[PDB]
Amino acid sequence: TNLCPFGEVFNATRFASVYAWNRKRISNCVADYSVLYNSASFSTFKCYGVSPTKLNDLCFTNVYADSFVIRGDEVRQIAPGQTGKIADYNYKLPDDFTGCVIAWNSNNLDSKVGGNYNYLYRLFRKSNLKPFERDISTEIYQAGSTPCNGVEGFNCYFPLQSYGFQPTNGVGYQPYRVVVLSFELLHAPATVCGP
């Protein structure tokens, strides 16, 4: 039968920004994790609520693939029960999370001489993000009593900022492509088993 398209998620040319993170719905396929078992290029491989083993003998209903690019120091924030800019304003995971987090260094693909300014993240927000919530609005953030009315100035800021990737930075500041897989099991019959 059909095999799940993990290669398209992992081996894609373009990755979305963290604030406008991408999500893909994988269903009606057999999932083969032998592609992930031995790769020698992954810097992070942590699975929450299920062992890395036993994945080929487990059946699930839906599998979601979330992909974005962040810096190395912010990879630790992609985990249940974490706080920070990325966790509170860009991407949130539930406390009771069943899934895996995979990250690898993409310094040779997403960094160019002079600075790559195509990846953005949100600085200001009124309230913390709920789990699996996506925000893409670009309205001017107001930090004072005076209304902004679209005239940027003091106490009226644009809520997005650029990463500015350079090839000479440290591994903490180098870009990392992060793929987050979320497995949900419901009363519906299993569709992704992968024996």
Partner: antibody
């Protein structure tokens, strides 16, 4: 007008508890990053705590587990709660706004309040 | 984790001269460094953010440059009002940002 007035200093015994307040004008303490910095007499500045617009709080290791930073939207005031004060906490405390635009920098400051812990 | 060190602990200049204050780091912090001016008895003032920018209202005689583990601050002309204490802050880490031991300045 933009201002930050601080009040709450005093003299307390070791092991005592004190609460510091820092109001605002033209600001909204629940919309801006806010931080507390203390400067002991004859020493350099030391960061204490920071609160995010969403509500997250971070503390330094030397003061972790004893201090607490809070805010009141109705009164537009930023609070610092200090517990289990030792002899090493004697300093002048400042409340400042932090802009994460290009790194974190403290543009506006206050005037400071003196907190002394002595036997 | 990161430890920052300024140099020197003191400095002097008469008038209309150039100064240089350096603030290293134990690890590379890219271009995330700030400069402050703390006159005695009152709160400090921000001078330079991101190691190269200038805060609105700051006099243009102040300038700074640097990257990685080495940074510097230069004053083109020493006006009478420029005598204070200056500090460097590490803005690289979002939650934990530390200061240096400071650098005073005085007449000779």
């Amino acid at each position: 007008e933009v201002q930050l007035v601080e009040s709450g200093g005093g003299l307390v015994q070791p092991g005592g508890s004190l609460r510091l307040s820092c109001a605002a004008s033209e600001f909204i303490v629940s919309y801006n990053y806010m931080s507390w910095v203390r400067q002991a007499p004859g020493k350099g500045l030391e960061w204490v705590s920071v609160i995010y617009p969403g509500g997250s709080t971070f503390y330094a290791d030397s003061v972790k587990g004893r201090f607490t930073i809070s805010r009141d939207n109705s009164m537009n005031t930023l609070f610092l709660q200090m517990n289990s004060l030792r002899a090493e906490d004697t300093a002048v405390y400042y409340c400042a706004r932090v802009l994460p635009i290009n790194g974190y920098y403290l543009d506006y400051w206050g005037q400071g309040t003196l907190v002394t812990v002595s036997s | 984790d990161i430890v920052m060190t300024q140099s020197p602990s003191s400095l002097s200049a008469s008038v209309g001269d150039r100064v240089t204050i350096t603030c290293r780091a134990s690890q590379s912090i890219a271009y995330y460094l700030n400069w402050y001016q703390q006159k005695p008895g009152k709160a400090p003032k921000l001078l330079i953010y991101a190691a190269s920018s200038l805060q609105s209202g700051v006099p243009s005689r102040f300038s700074g440059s640097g990257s990685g583990t080495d940074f510097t601050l230069t004053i083109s002309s020493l006006q009478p009002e420029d005598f204070a204490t200056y500090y460097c802050q590490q803005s690289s880490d979002p939650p934990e940002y530390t200061f240096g031991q400071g650098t005073k300045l005085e007449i000779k």
